[PDB]
Structure formats: structure tokens, C-alpha cells
């Protein structure tokens with residue numbers, strides 16, 4: 001229905017706004033673009049599903065997310081990839097893991113405050129009907 005297409009258009013507006021606020025935060029610059037294969041040649045042998053905030057924007061516009069739960073799977077994949085690839089005690093690895101945890105925690109806190117639970121439930125019931 002036209003009403004259901006309006007629901008998903010509002011979801012995409014909300015997701016672009018949250019993603020922009022993450023992408024402008026200085027702490028999260030390292031997560032804004034795909035890892036460059038030339039600079040990190042082993043990255044794609046260790047990390048089987050790369051993800052970054054530029055790819056998340058492209059996926060919103062391709063209608064890949066029908067729910068906020070769908071979107072948060074990809075935010076969680078950015079964080080888990082960073083914790084897996086950078087697990088050591090040295091300061092460079094501890095800094096990136098601290099930033100990855102802060103990206104996850106910040107996304108979840110914006111959504112807890114600004115996403116209406118009944119809006120999310122409507123998106124989930126439309127998704128389930130298709």
C-alpha cells in the first residue's frame with residue numbers, strides 16, 4: 001500500500017540522519033570508508049564481510065533495510081570486524097577497539113532516544129507480511 005511505502009520512506013530518512021551524525025564524529029573517521037586493499041592486503045583474507053558507514057548509506061538508498069533491527073546488524077558488523085582484526089595489547093589496537101565500542105554504543109543510544117517503538121513494530125509487521 002501507499003501508506004506502507006510512506007512508512008519505509010520515513011525509515012530511510014531516520015537512518016540517513018543517524019548515519020550522518022556517526023560519520024561526522026572525529027572518533028569514527030577510521031569506519032567511514034572501506035579498508036583500502038593496497039594499505040592492508042591481509043584484511044580481506046581475515047574479515048569475510050567488510051562493512052563501513054559509506055556502504056551503509058549506499059544500502060539505505062538501495063532499500064536494503066526494512067527495519068532498524070536490519071540496520072543495527074550492519075553497525076554491529078562494523079564493530080565486531082574491528083574487535084576481530086585488531087585484538088592485541090598494543091596501543092594502536094586498544095585505541096581502535098575503544099572507538100569501535102563507542103560507535104556501537106552511540107548508535108544504540110541515539111536509537112533508544114529517537115526511534116518510536118510502535119514505528120519499529122509497524123516496520124517489522126509489514127516486513128513479516130511480504
Ligand SMILES: CCNC(=O)N1CCN(C(C)=O)CC1
Nearest residue numbers: 030035039040081082085086
Ligand atoms: C596497516 C595499518 N592498518 C590499517 O590501516 N588499518 C586501518 C583500519 N582497520 C580497521 C578498520 O580494522 C585496521 C587496519
